[PDB]
Amino acid sequence: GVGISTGTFNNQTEFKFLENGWVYITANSSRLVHLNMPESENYRRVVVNNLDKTAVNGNMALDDTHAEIVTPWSLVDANAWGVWFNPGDWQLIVNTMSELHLVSFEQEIFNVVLKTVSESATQPPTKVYNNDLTASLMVALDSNNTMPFTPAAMRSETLGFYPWKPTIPTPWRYYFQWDRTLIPSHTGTSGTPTNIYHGTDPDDVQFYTIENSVPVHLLRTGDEFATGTFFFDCKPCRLTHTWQTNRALGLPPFLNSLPQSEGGTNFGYIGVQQDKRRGVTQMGNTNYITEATIMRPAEVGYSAPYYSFEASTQGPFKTPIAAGRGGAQTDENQAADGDPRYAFGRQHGQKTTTTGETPERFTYIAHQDTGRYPEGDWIQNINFNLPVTDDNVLLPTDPIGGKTGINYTNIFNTYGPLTALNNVPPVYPNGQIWDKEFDTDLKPRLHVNAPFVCQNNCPGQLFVKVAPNLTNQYDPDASANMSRIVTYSDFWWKGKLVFKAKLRASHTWNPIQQMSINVDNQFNYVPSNIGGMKIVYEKSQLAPRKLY
């Protein structure tokens, strides 16, 4: 009815301990979602153009041109880590768990409130918020995944991370195909390169509408909604990082001269001269056996062009990389291609009392040492004469194509049948939890955005929209915008997300890295005197595991 609630708030996290070291983690989230009525009931096809910015020669990387269908619906997206876990729960998970399985997800909407704003014509303006006991909220669940998948975490548009702060949904839109060509240039390039928006290819047009593709429930103030329980099939994630690179794989060389005194400079010596040694190498014409030349079972990580932009039907896009940079842990200023950089606002981690439009940003320096250090790379001739002469070695200090600032590493690629790499580690709080596998015939090995990728399917996107509340003067043959009573809605969204984890075992003598509250970061996990709150980022793969 009207005065009877249709659900209960719940934001607790439960750890149910099972047999054989497994833990059933139940993350409950509950939010108060506020939704204004849409700008216009009509779907729009909007072409966004930034031809002004790109026209400046050498600025092609800043292309934003595209075409998108903008819809009257709003998306309720909970695909982010911060929605489910507070820093303490994440601390427990990372410090104690070794692997994380995604099990199930269900969500529901209850306690729907619809209100109308009546503004008086009094000389001093005033407005009063009445209820509307008959207005409806349209809720559509795309259980069949008939609509384009649009994860909001990539735009920091998921629900809030604070249970006590109301959150808003995101207006839904999806890309409409377009043809666009942009020939790159540089500062000082003469003339105007070909920079053109070509329209649309009819063979690719796709105009989706929620009304035609999904059943839409109408929820009055006394109604409820529940999506039911979906079950994932994603592969297990590891909360452990690998440190062994190719140089640390296998049996080290026996030391014939061990050190005899403590001290940093009292090194040990192998003894056998490098050309008189034993072992196996992939160098069929060289007698030298060294740690750099000795055969290894396979290659850890791979090299790829960094900051490479490739163009296609829709224009240029950065080539993604599956691993971070090398040595970034020693110097953050060297954090570069491959280390995801998250920007977010006051709903998703930034201090809630901050003023201004500037967002809060952080670069994630993954622990795993699967990355590369392109400055230490080099190529040398097949003859392998040592020391290598100038003409027989290509170095990162060598110009390629006549450019002083570009070297061979910028275009080098070593992905091969021997390559081995790890999945992207979870990013708290702003990291995405799951993502949809592509419908291509050959599917990518991993996604750079989510640790869980969806083999068959995973939960349909949930859409909400304030049903139109017409005035008596409605005339559908009028070309003007529909006349609607100012109406908004507030409804409680509750979700339950179920993981399964294994509790880690101490394999080694020494202790391992752990997350701990300390004097330097103490105040990031408590409110300020004026209620300000922030959710700083936390690393997720502290414990090390042996690669080989």
């Epitope: 153009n49 930034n50 031809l51 910015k53 400046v56 500062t187």
Partner: nanobody, 132 residues
């Protein structure tokens, strides 16, 4: 629709400095390539300078090179022209205008391409003179 509005033009002593302003109305200023042009009385239209939307690059004519400095403030939604080292030749009416960055191919404009050399909208203008 919104329009531009110039201000700051006036007689000033030769060799001095001044600062012309061009207020912009409408949401397109942050997205538009801005330009300054000047017209000496009964003379031919003379380009002064241009600056892109993001203040990434600036261009001037040799006649004002090293003397004029164009700048913009999206927070104030305005453009400015610092006319340092004023010279007798600066006496003219100065306008701020918008350079058309996109030109549509089909007459109904289902396809667009970048270009330069056409000014879409013009401001009111301000008169500047250089004399003692």
């Amino acid at each position: 629709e919104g329009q531009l509005a110039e201000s700051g033009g006036d007689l000033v002593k030769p060799g001095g400095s001044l600062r012309l302003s061009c207020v912009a109305s409408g949401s397109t200023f942050r997205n538009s390539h801005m330009t300054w042009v000047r017209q000496a009385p009964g003379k031919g239209l003379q380009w002064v300078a241009n600056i892109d939307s993001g203040a990434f690059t600036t261009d001037y004519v040799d006649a004002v090179r090293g003397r004029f400095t164009v700048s913009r403030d999206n927070a104030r939604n305005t453009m400015y022209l610092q006319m340092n080292s004023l010279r007798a030749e600066d006496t003219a009416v100065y306008y701020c205008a918008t350079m058309k960055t996109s030109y549509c191919i089909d007459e109904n404009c289902f396809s667009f391409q970048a270009g330069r050399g056409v000014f879409d909208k013009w401001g009111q203008g301000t008169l500047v003179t250089v004399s003692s």
